[model samples]
Target: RESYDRLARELGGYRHPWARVLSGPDPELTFDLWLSRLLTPQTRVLEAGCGHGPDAARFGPQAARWAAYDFSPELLKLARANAPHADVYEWNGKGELPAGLGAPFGLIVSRRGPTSVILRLPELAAPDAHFLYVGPRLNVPEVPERLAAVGWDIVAEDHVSVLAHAPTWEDWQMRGEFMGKLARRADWDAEATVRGMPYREERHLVLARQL
Candidate 1:
């Protein structure tokens, strides 16, 4: 939480422009657009780790109800400001969720959020609940199988990626440095990654429904 608070205070939360570029140049494939298709007027949404509540602000009104949580109070403050309509809470994604949280959500989403919360989702999900998860592919290779073990079947899946693109070599170097810091890659080389621009980090977007 302390680390996140510092990052949020210094870097304006984790959502970066480079990440947007990495999701590909198509606006339709962006997280907001991709998730928008799954929403409906009757959707009851619960987000596991809504960093700064930008999604809550954008999608809250579109759903029947919206609630989200984050461990960092600093980020929560920004989240509240970003989406005053959302039911925001401070949680670490462990044990029982707060009793006050409106559960049995029809749609549960976790975007680079806490992965542990999925273990408790069955108890909190509606009969026809759907779960959306987006995370680094390398870190979560077992996620699909794990969901299946819990009786949630993958209904849609996509491996999202695009080569690192920047207007100048300096900007590319800066982007590479940011990625390295985020990934904790001790041997990250900006020039080397630039040379390997044909390949880049990939994230998996999975939409699963309870079997």
Candidate 2:
């Protein structure tokens, strides 16, 4: 799996342009707020799917211990280079936590990773530990109920629209036709076909804690 490297190449290419924007080297904002609230100087943090280690560099210094894992070695290399202080590993998000992680971590975080990983939280967290997950806010059927069933407590949620400067109606229609035809060629599902028909893009953000 480590040698396959498809995920590594994809994420490395996908994140290259946005790397600087996402990984603020100074005065960490959102990450600082969440880490300060959920972690202590003695706390251990495990960042599942820690792509490129921007979050590690943002939050690692605050915690007593920090470990991160991702499926992509290319991203892991970037993450290690970005945050040399952390213990980074190559891991598959679908499997069990690595051996010798010791007790549950004080904080476990996943950003834009698989929603299925939330099922492993209770087993990976300390009794008072907290969790923070950030992903697209668009309604994904069965997601909310799955979180609740996994012993997570709803704490907060927010939405930040990414398409504030969308095209005009006519401009959108023109682009939509192009995209719609492409989607048809790709044999996209009904919902995707509709989404590609015009200027239709909506996203959301969610924040939750382990109970």
Candidate 3:
């Protein structure tokens, strides 16, 4: 737990774009597709672990109300600034939601955060709630099997590739140095850093609904 918390003891809001610029192919769409289907001007959305409100800012206009929570006050501060029309709160996210989020969320979605964050879905979901989870692509069996193990009705599963390219020498230098150092914490050396150029990010998404 301390290791996860220590991932970024005190980081900057500017981390997102630089990371994206290195891995520049818009993994954002992996989420936008499912959300846009039910996200009308009248639906409510609960975006958990909403980093910097990129998704909220993109979808806020369509939702009747948008509520988001994260573990970082620093990111939440910027998320508040990014999506003024939405409500942003903070939580430790250990299998629970924050107080006053108003149950029966029309949709609960998280980008790249695992299902563990909101494990008690029945209490927070509406009778017809929809859930979308985007996580790392790491399997011969794509959907993480755990989604069904946890009682969600798995309906859609797909993969998207966000290709990475070091557009310039400086891009490679900055990202390679930073991410390389972080990778060492796990005794892993990344080839992408050494290549100084293109790589691929194959991400997987599992879409489910309350059964």
Candidate 4:
């Protein structure tokens, strides 16, 4: 939460151009398009680790109810500002959802949220609830198994690899350093932008339903 607070407050929120610049090209499979298909006027949505609520602001209007939570108070403030109609809460991602969180949601989404919170999702989910999880494949490889252990079955899975692309060495260096900070990598080198050294990130996208 503290680290995320720094990200939201000082680092200009989580959605920055530094990381986007390295994203070589948009994947053929877009997560937003997939998510949009599942949304309805009756859908009750809950988002974990909502950051500055960009997703909420973007998709909240389509759903009947939208509620999101994050551990960072600073981020929650920005989230509330970004999505005024949606309910936002500060939660530690332990135990149960808060009373004001509007649980028993029909759809839950998490973008690299806490595992503890993801495990408890089945309990808070409504009948026919669906979950969408997006995260770095290497960072959380156990997520699919973890979801299955909690009685959630993966309905769809996609692995996407995004290769790095930058116009110049200076641009690459700047973006690379920021990416290191974002990823919390200790071994970051500013002078290592060689010709064959292209950054690559593998991402995992999962859509699951209760078993």
Best by TM-score: 4
The model with the greater TM-score, 2 or 3, is 3
TM-scores, in order shown? 0.77, 0.65, 0.71, 0.78
Tens-digit lDDT string for candidate 2 (95-127): 666776654787777665566666777777787
How well is each residue in 6-94 modelled by candidate 4, as lDDT tens digits? 67454353333443344466542466777888799999998888888888999898999889988778778988999997999889888
- Better structure of 3 and 4 per TM-score: 4
What is the C-alpha local distance difference test score of each model? 0.73, 0.61, 0.67, 0.73
Off by over 4 Å in 3: 1-27, 136-143, 167-196
Give the distance in Å from residue 188's predicted Cα in candidate 2 to where it truly belongs: 21
* Candidate 4: clashing pairs of residues: none
- For model 1, where is the 10-residue window of minimal lDDT? 183-192
TM-score, cand. 1: 0.77
Instruction: Give model 3 RMSD, 1 decimal.
Output: 6.0
RMSD of each predicted structure: 4.7, 7.8, 6.0, 4.9
Q: By the lDDT metric, which is better: model 1 or model 3?
A: 1
Would you give me the overall lDDT of model 1? 0.73
Q: State in Å the error of residue 11, model 2.
A: 4.8
Weakest 10 consecutive residues of candidate 4 by summed lDDT? 183-192
Off by over 4 Å in 2: 1-32, 140-143, 166-203
